[PDB]
Design a protein around this ligand. Sequence first.
Ligand SMILES: CCNC(=O)C1(Cc2ccc(-c3cc(Cl)cc(Cl)c3)cc2)CCN(C(=O)COC)CC1
Lengths: 75, 169
Amino acid sequence: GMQIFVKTLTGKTITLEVEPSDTIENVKAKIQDKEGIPPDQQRLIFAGKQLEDGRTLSDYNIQKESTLHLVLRLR
Amino acid sequence: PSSQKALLLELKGLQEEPVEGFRVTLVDEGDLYNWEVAIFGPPNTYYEGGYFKARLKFPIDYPYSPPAFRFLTKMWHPNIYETGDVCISILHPPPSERWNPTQNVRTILLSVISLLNEPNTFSPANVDASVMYRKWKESKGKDREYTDIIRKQVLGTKVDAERDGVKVP
Ligand SMILES: CCNC(=O)C1(Cc2ccc(-c3cc(Cl)cc(Cl)c3)cc2)CCN(C(=O)COC)CC1
């Protein structure tokens, strides 16, 4: 159990309760929970890299109290 | 003009809380409508070790009109013209991808990070690079033509870094 953050483009910070092994696809399931934005349109960025779904938080070494940056892509 | 004050606050805001991998300055001190952007390629990427340079042109309407983003470094990318100009949806004059007065430089810069991560193969500025990028992604990385061009350009930025006196982090 950890506590990470997700900053958005408007300025709000979204703190979410995750595990180090949570897949990125589930991290954005929790963001449709809180903001209603479809998970297919979300893009999380950590250390200048778009975190891909099908990988864990531990695959990109995201620790406690980390901040991710959400950007949106229609596609 | 409100554009001048908006750009001073945004420069100060982006220098106190930098976008990671981005360093913003003024081309000439006293002109807030013309920014120097020094981008750094992140680890675990084909751009690792790079030192790329770009420039931002802000209009007097700012933020009611989008600025212009132009790489000085040559870039091989499906959404970067031969001039260096980047075709991003947000920089186009007229939802979160289109320009509004609510958008800021931090929004632009993060959008450029996303666009470097995932090219928009639907509106290619460099068709030859878009058609080269897609055979890379469909080969699942096997075809190395695209990543060879990228790595050649990334290797050459080391000369640029020495001239500007920049220690690549
Ligand atoms: C074809 C090139 N693509 C890439 O390098 C990848 C995407 C990418 C990510 C970031 C940036 C970038 C970010 C910033 Cl902030 C500044 C700059 Cl200049 C670039 C460029 C491209 C996809 C291929 N990769 C993987 O699969 C590896 O996973 C472990 C390596 C990373």
